Amino acid sequence: MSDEGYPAEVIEIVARTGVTGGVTQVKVRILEGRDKGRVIRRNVKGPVRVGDIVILRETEREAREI
RNA sequence: CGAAUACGUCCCUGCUCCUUGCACACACCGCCCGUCACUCCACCCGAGCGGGGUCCGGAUGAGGCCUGAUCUCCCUUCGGGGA
């Protein structure tokens, strides 16, 4: 089972986030769908290294922060 | 014998430093305020009582000193004079 999720490759790590420091804000680039290159900034939970791939249930949320 | 998870954060709980304000420095378990109650102190407002000054009146007012009459006494230069 894998619903309409859209892959997204991680290109750059930015600061960490979360009240308890578990979250990591990150810059990612979609790979499939209609964007096919539109970078975007998401708040990801867990360990990440560049090159990782996170799949998103949407793409039009775009949390932003410093 | 033998892992899971994170490779971070200050949210909670604590510590360290810097900065700021403070009526605190046995240092916030700090300092401190007023009412009420208890003891004492002197100080007002004073009912009341009783004196003593002082200004106005009213009345009486001792006494002395001026004078008029009258009386008595003594001196008389017979003029009066004195008490």
Side-chain angles (χ1 to χ4, degrees), chain A residues 8 28-31 34-42 58-62:
Chain A
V28 73
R29 164 143 48 71
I30 296 88
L31 314 177
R34 74 279 188 192
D35 302 278
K36 297 294 300 307
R38 189 173 82 95
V39 313
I40 201 79
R41 160 182 297 186
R42 302 290 288 241
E58 54 268 12
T59 76
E60 295 83 46
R61 283 191 68 230
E62 183 43 284

Side-chain angles (χ1 to χ4, degrees), chain A residues 51-62:
Chain A
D52 282 334
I53 288 151
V54 195
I55 80 178
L56 318 175
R57 290 179 66 190
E58 54 268 12
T59 76
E60 295 83 46
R61 283 191 68 230
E62 183 43 284

Side-chain angles (χ1 to χ4, degrees), chain A residues 13-18 21-26 42-48:
Chain A
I13 307 293
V14 298
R16 289 168 145 285
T17 48
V23 188
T24 291
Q25 180 87 264
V26 76
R42 302 290 288 241
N43 272 341
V44 54
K45 208 189 184 149
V48 275

